[PDB]
Each structure stands twice: as C-alpha cells, then as structure tokens.
Amino acid sequence: MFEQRVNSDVLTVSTVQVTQKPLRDSVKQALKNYFAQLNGQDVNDLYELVLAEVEQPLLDMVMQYTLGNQTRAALMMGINRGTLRKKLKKYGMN
Amino acid sequence: DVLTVSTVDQVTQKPLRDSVKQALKNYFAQLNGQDVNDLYELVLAEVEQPLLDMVMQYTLGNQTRAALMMGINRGTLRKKLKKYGMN
Q1: Domain tally for chain B?
Q2: Ranges assigned E (strand) in A1-94
Q3: In chain A, N or C: fewer CB atoms in 10 Å?
Q4: Beta-carbon contacts of residue A68 (< 8 Å; ≥ 6 apart)
Q5: Which residues of B57-73 are buried (b: 16+ CB within 10 A; e: fewer)?
Q6: Could you tell me which of A48, A91, A87, A20 has the C-alpha nearest to residue B23?
Q7: Which of A31, A65, A79 sits opposite B51 (nearest CB)?
Q8: Sign (positive/negative) of CA torsion B5, A42, B75, A47?
Q9: Cβ neighbours of residue A28 under 8 Å, at least 6 residues apart?
Q10: Distances in whole angstroms, Cα of residue B34 to Cα of each of A6, B29, B45
Q11: In sequence order, which residues have a C-beta less than 8 Å from that of residue B61 and are 6 or more positions away?
Q12: CATH of residue A72
C-alpha cells in the first residue's frame, strides 16, 4: 500500500575482469568461512562479533571525515552524541 | 580474526573490517559535500541482512536457535527479520 523511506546509496567493494559487488556479500562470505571453521562449535554472541567488525571501521572513517568533530559525526550517522560517545568508548576510541 | 574474506593470483584472508573500510572509502569519495543524516542505518541494513540470512540458513529457520547463536532475544530477531521483509 505504501512505499518506505530509506537511504538507497550503495556500498561496494572490488572483485576480480574487475567489477564492484555489494558490501553485504563480503559479510556473507566472512560468515560462511566463520561457520566453516566453527564446525558446529557453540556461539552465542555473533551479532556483537559482526557489529564490532563493522562499527570500528565506520567510526574511524566518519571521524576522519569530520576531522574528529563528534557533533558532526553523530549528525551524519543519524545518532545522538550520547550513543556515539558510548560506541567509541566501547572500542577504546574514546 | 574470526571474520575474514578471501582476496586474490593466490588467495589470502583479510579481515572483514577491511571490506567495510574500502566500501566507506568509495562512499565518502562520491559524497561530494552532499549531506547525510542516516549513515549508521545505511551500514546497518547492509550488514544485518546478510547476517540474518546466514544465521537463519545455518539454524534451518529455527528462531530460538538463531537468536541464541546471535546473542539477541527473539523479539529483537523478529523485529529485524520483519524490517527487512525476511519474515
């Protein structure tokens, strides 16, 4: 009945003829390899595991982009400074 | 380094964070001063979807085992699945 509002910009990486492929596929491949090594081992924190692998490079890139300005970083990210501060502290980036 | 992707004519493993960084580098380069207010959401959708897809395949669609493996409650799991039209 109704369409949605979302950011439709793309995130891609290079693959090799060289072409781009969606970032989501890298996450997918990394998980396949992860399960392959796990071989039925117990895991109970996969969300946290993946999130840490993704948030760190994101925080660094946005901070680098805003030259360290946290106010503009929170704005660009669509998160309040409180949540931003919390994520940085979480990864020792304070 | 439990999360890695294959890279190449020999193939070697590189951390997933390196893929995320490369993609953001491409993203920021084309931003061209344009403004953005939801970059976290854009990245989240890009990584949550494949994570959900893979965990659900690996647990045969069993929500209770999927949520335990992820370390989130089922209500949360369900909300994310519905958000991405995967329910």
Answers
A1: 1
A2: 12-15, 19-22
A3: N
A4: none
A5: ebbeeeeeebbbbbebe
A6: A20
A7: A31
A8: negative
A9: B50, B53, B54
A10: 16, 11, 21
A11: none
A12: 1.10.10.60
Tell me which chain B residues have a C-beta less than 8 angstroms from the C-beta of A57. Answer: 17-18, 20-21, 24
Give the resolution in Å.
1.9
- If you count them, how many residues does chain A have? 94
**Whole domain around residue A4: which residue ranges?**
1-94
Say whether B7 sits in a helix, a strand or coil: strand
Contacts of A54 in chain B (CB under 8 A): 16-17, 20, 43, 47
Contact (CB<8Å) B38/A78: yes
